[PDB]
Amino acid sequence: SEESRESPAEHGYYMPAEWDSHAQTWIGWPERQDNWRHNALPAQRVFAGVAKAISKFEPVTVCASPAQWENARKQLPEDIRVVEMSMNDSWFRDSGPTFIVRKRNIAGIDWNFNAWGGANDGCYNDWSHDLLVSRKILALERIPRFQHSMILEGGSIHVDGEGTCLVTEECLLNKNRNPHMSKEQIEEELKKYLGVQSFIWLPRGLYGDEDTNGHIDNMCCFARPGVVLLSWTDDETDPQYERSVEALSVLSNSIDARGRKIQVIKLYIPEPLYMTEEESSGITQDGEAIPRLAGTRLAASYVNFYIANGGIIAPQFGDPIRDKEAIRVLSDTFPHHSVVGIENAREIVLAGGNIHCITQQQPAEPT
Ligand SMILES: [Cl-]
Ligand SMILES: [Cl-]
Ligand SMILES: [Cl-]
Ligand SMILES: [Mg+2]
Ligand code: NA
Ligand code: NA
Ligand code: NA
């Protein structure tokens, strides 16, 4: 697939910050038995709970496969729209479109996609349906579409809506993504497509986040211009510690696109979590996806929350201090939003991501 003849930036578009006004949220529906234990049922109920929480703030559409449409329609309240859509898995932060707006005044970017690392390093062996998800979503809404040839997922990029793009090297410079492109070329395309002017490159993402090779959205995100929330631990024996300290070092020497120094709020990860034998035993091995093994360190961070209209939808991992700390810190950081916790978010992390990874915001169209 080739590139649109003109970029978003050439038409005045840019990607707004996640905390700007939404028209709705898009979410996919999990099903594949070699990624979601017990026929996906525990995860489906958590997805449904996330969708329902977001629906209290703004409209939601859930997309479910032909096989699943009736199941999703039963499991979701009636004010959530459910539409039929083929997909190889349910991570719409990554396979869905990255919306852009201008002051038609909304468009969507359809990045190329390879299941987070392709034939030799990706999470499953067929992403043919996933390749059409963005086209189908934008067609459903009648929103124009820019197409890129470069591989990218929405979970790998974060913006402040003021010209800054926060990314990780571990992901976007990985040879499993766009090995034909340099760092500078990748920057130029993101300027052209996101409407950004400058970058903050963290070297690495969250420890344990092998699915995505260190997506930024599981490591660090903006809370508002000039302020980030960073996954943190004080425990020097956790391999997360050296990643967090290194990110802190970079951020505390970083300037945003408008010349601000970055202030960092630490958001402590839960006490380390590991997949149980009982969890792993509910997952099939059909030779189509990466294995899910007992003992794996879960890539769990409260940074993988989602911002909706007046709501923050945050994971809860069962940790008897870090869950409530995360709710408090987020409540203080977003004092005009209601902070909602989602219990059993572990069910999503077992499969490689969390709340932010299963959502994709559709901005309100400026008038
Ligand atoms: Cl209800
Ligand atoms: Cl400011
Ligand atoms: Cl694993
Ligand atoms: Mg795409
Ligand atoms: Na892991
Ligand atoms: Na990967
Ligand atoms: Na063990």
UniProtKB/Swiss-Prot annotation:
Q: What is the lineage of its organism?
A: Eukaryota, Viridiplantae, Streptophyta, Embryophyta, Tracheophyta
Taxonomically, the superkingdom here is Eukaryota
Keywords from UniProt, A to Z, are:
Hydrolase, Polyamine biosynthesis
- Which PANTHER family does the entry mention? AGMATINE DEIMINASE, AGMATINE DEIMINASE-RELATED
Q: Which family does it belong to?
A: Belongs to the agmatine deiminase family.
Residues where agmatine binds:
D211, D217
The species this protein belongs to is Arabidopsis thaliana (Mouse-ear cress)
Record-given protein name: Agmatine deiminase
Q: Which NCBIfam families match?
A: agmatine_aguA, PRK13551.1
Q: How is its activity regulated?
A: Inhibited by N-ethylmaleimide and iodoacetamide.
Task: Name the SUPFAM superfamilies on file.
Answer: Pentein
Quaternary structure?
A: Forms homodimers.
Reactions catalysed: agmatine + H2O = N-carbamoylputrescine + NH4(+)
Gene name linked to the record = AIH
